[model samples]
Target: GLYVEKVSGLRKDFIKGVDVSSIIALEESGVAFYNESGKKQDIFKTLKEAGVNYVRVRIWNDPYDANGNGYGGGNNDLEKAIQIGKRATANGMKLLADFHYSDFWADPAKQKAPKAWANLNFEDKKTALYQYTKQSLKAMKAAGIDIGMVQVGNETNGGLAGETDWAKMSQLFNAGSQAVRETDSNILVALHFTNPETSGRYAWIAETLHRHHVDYDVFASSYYPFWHGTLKNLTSVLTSVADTYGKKVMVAETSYTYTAEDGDGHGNTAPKNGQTLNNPVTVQGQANAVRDVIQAVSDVGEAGIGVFYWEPAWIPVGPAHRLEKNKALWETYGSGWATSYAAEYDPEDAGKWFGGSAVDNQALFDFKGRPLPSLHVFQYVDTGTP
Candidate 1:
């Protein structure tokens, strides 16, 4: 009864969330935002007013280098995440805390173990995972920030715990899931993986977790059209996976590039090189992409939850995003987390590692911080038809 009551309050009309994880960093970089009326305002408030019902903030165990210099992608430490969560809650938005588990980015390709946990073997790492999970929940509560849902690990495909052993990954993930369920059975716990088109691969992971008795409430998929496939492919796989696994489903991360060219001189992240679906990289195209994603999720009927746009506020600024002056700060990232982009940081390539936000062109906000037409697409946000 309590669980139902708690979740009924926690779940929103539809989870129209934006991962403004980059908002704090963007603001610090002097990237100011304005509404359609040209009034300077907060990103969180603006997004909520735009019909967003949830705020998804990713928390890194420790995102600072050995000397304590910050990482560029939000550097979402515990305090940073809680502060953002508090702001979102104040704006009447539920919070979805994503534990990257690594010190930096944790995606399908890179789920590096945090620096502190790198040396520990499986058993010791499991203990650390439990503490990290419970401590995070405890921290949020202590700070008066309520987390509606928590993701055990972000985009785990090859495996988590910094290995390819799927069984070991199940064990590591169970530690976090158990901790959340133990704390509050009402709090939704999610297990995320990228590329929804690969339903069989996702099913294998889901079945593995079930075999190990690892409880999970949601199976989150990250779908990038170019990386995954078309909306039809997404819908087909999502429905199949949900029906087969008998769990709630969501597109925890999705986005589209608005322009083929980057205004910030930081080349567009979602390259328009050879990738072109039904929509071109135009403002209307982006809006259409948003509609397609949400509509596809809505078509899933009862099990479909919603979608979250990843880093929709990561716009680039003139002096703010200039990495040359902050080379020492940028280069401080330790060898603990060697991401896929680590080897791809070309000094001349404007979208290089220390360059700037590769997603700058893909932002829902223009370079000047004005909300794009695509922002209106969320006004029609649909979680489900049923």
Candidate 2:
């Protein structure tokens, strides 16, 4: 029943997906991609043929400034997400809607409330969460994209709406769940947490959700070798959480840089970040890393459902080349000072400024936007062979 199956030749029980949140921005910026054979193929069509059964695109409340200028890191607004979903559907890919619930990024480190929701009290914030989720799903529905799944919040283990507000955050989580239910009871709702190596933390999150009576369908975790731990640690954690919670589990975000070298003039985001693993950061290593990780999740049996390769299409483009700009956003968000990448962001020189592909090293596509061998090898998890 997976919407992407008709095209990708995959199964619903085993999800092979990629987070293409950067597609809209990359396309708008005129980024063209090619297959391993060097012929330019439609990005979506190529992935479908490569055994990608699902497409995950994240949505922000508003990624633009008051003057309608974008913040430039994916700039994944609701409209853009819907547009991406339309393309996904057209290409026979099931869409997984990831709601970050923030104007920019939302993760364990920071979960800033959207600017429009800044004034709402704890109680009212819950209402806003419900309204937003409901309206968003409705909009996507109206646009005629079959939203197969939805994540209430992204990497919200610390707490959502604001950091360290678990009580309010629990309420917010419930509100989001309620909205998803109201919109379409059939749509699976995911509660995403970061760092899959921590079993204790995830068990606590499960308990909190149970206490709040939040009926989420998926226990999604983010596992990055440079940020989390070894495959053994991740496998153990996934097993423990699945056994303890008895809920379906998924690796909601993961990636491995194919090289130590930076792709664009702006530093690449996939280099080692204090943590290390046995796999070298080469293309074969990237393939092995994901293959090993996916096997670890598969080891958990049916409960271990899926792993989503995060931002597999986020290549570097000039922030200057983009149409949207907000002088106000620079002051507010501080020129996107830090990236969601494991490493800290340092402003490169003028020639290195904004036109580089920061994550091209980790992407399935090369700096030239050509498909990597890892992309083909990645299909073996479903095929059971390379």
Candidate 3:
């Protein structure tokens, strides 16, 4: 019973619902889990229990070392992905295939080409992309799953495939769609774009897709207030994307650091934008922001399928943050010296914050693992009892 999938295939237990876009680390285990139980409660179990119904697994072309032995970006290479697919089946959750088209992370700021796929020219790259995507989906299908959704590539604002391969990303998209449909005719092809608050950004993107008549089932965007904009602005952006794209909208990647003070151990965040956990990064603020985006999107109807808090439970584990060790004021340095000092980053943010860069310090949960007052809003928005 615990094996996940059966010969009968995925059991259908639920009806129509919303999509909660989430990459693994479901219960917040910072990075990907090497073993099924990298933490206490199984991530799949915890997530299904917490109202999460979808699992978004990012697939890299060939993440491995010299021996071709799979790399361990949480075993996220593919086998781990198969395991996740199995779990999602057993858990009755849908899987959203996020193809990074890279060996590792692929965000707006970083889209490094795969180790081997680097030298291929544009046309060859198209053939490679199609074959690559086709074979990948085939492998997983042979393993157990025929993914429910396919994200051509992650945060491809400048265009996907690669730096110069921009003009051909559409071809890649076509290839992925064709491959997926052949894999599972019911599969939905979703084009992902994180940081979608800038209306102009998505406008240009959507216009380009429209011009090309790019075929994709859902239209997804990422919204993070600190950098994206305020709630009001995020709403306007969502409305614009929904109306302009003519496809369903989703906040695919969104989350406010629960605590900038303690998140230094977890890389990929900073404190230089005059943004901080206390300023407007409070639990209430974060909750409100998410709500604003959701409500704005909800009005768009079915196309607005979901809102995913990027790392709601991404707990800090050892020296694993983006700020680098001995770098966060939260971390202990030689005796009593902190590597981060007001004199270096921002003297104005001396004691209370991290130069307004992180809002996690004021997240929905407290550092000690307790839910903060700000978390109540997600559940008690109509009480009229502040």
Candidate 4:
């Protein structure tokens, strides 16, 4: 087990969360997770035992082609989200329902509208987004899932549902936010964005949201250390947002490499060319990175909610040497980041780069699914190991 210094002034209720959106697909690919006793266990049970209080699951509108082929990023349609949510709830963890508002991945680069809404006018699109969000939340609730937070969009720094104009995007955001409010006022509405390191990017976004009166409770940012700036900058930026806007702040996505070796055949996003590393590529380094992120968020005073580790258990389904076999599993089960079928939807990116788990090396578990020592960091952060 790894030793982590206790985070000073950490809130007892601060969220220790992980995005396990890929777990179902990985399981269907014949992958299994084990506990410290080397016995097969439900991944959620292991995560809850590790002190994880929240589970984040991404919901794509329709991640499938005309022939029903999955887009291969966990096939995270509403059905899959429900499945993950049920497990999380059963394991005594709250759920964060992340709606991408697209048929596939929606990031700063590509926030394509769902195919059903592709031809709708701006007004109609907003209605459709509202309806989709309301209907999805109803379904998840019908399934008895305990949804605590709803992310209106994922990494929508530039656009959302194919609309790049800030004015138009703000309307779409309000539509989604309104749906969440109707579904359950107790649920927190989070608007996620990335690239916090960029000069004045967050300030500008916050100002724009204020100008548009975009209603939301959480101002969330992804904090991948390799690309994002130092932890001090993270604290300063989040504090600015929290103090200035009076919105709760948090790290919606963050991870670090535990090893340099690729577990799956696909090329990884980190430990690659041009990415800076602040810590050594080891399990201890991974632990330290996660602890620091928690501390950074905690530093924002009462408005600092939590830090969520992104895809911590998205380990490889098979060995890297067996590329053909691994590709079969990835394509069949949507266990990888993206598959060839995504080409039609995202021809520029996923079309050419579809492959297996790109962050397997960074997972808190080894390629074979055994939890790493670093997985203990979540627990150790609250109190230093003696």
- Which lDDT value does model 2 have at 365? 79
Please, what is the whole-model Cα lDDT of each candidate in the order they appear?
A: 0.74, 0.73, 0.54, 0.94
lDDT of 2 by residue, 275-322 (tens): 675688888788877887777787777688888898777654434333
Off by over 4 Å in 3: 1-40, 67-75, 197-199, 263-273, 276-285, 319-386
Which pairs clash (backbone N, Cα, C closer than 3 Å) in model 4? Answer: none
Best by TM-score: 4
Global lDDT of model 3: 0.54
Least accurate 10 contiguous residues by lDDT in model 1: 1-10
Return the top candidate by lDDT. 4
RMSD of 4: 0.8
- The deviation in Å at residue 327 for candidate 4 is 0.9
Residues 1-386, candidate 1: write the lDDT tens digits: 00000112123466788888866665665568999898998888898888898889988887766656565566688888989988998898888999988877777777788888989989999989999999888888887876789999989888675866877887888899888987888889898888766657766777787887777888898877866877887777778768987888889998888876665544555765566566777787787777777777867767788889888877765534454543332333321112223332212221234545677777898878898867867764433111
- TM-score each candidate: 0.87, 0.86, 0.70, 0.99
TM-score of candidate 3 on Cα atoms, chains taken together? 0.70
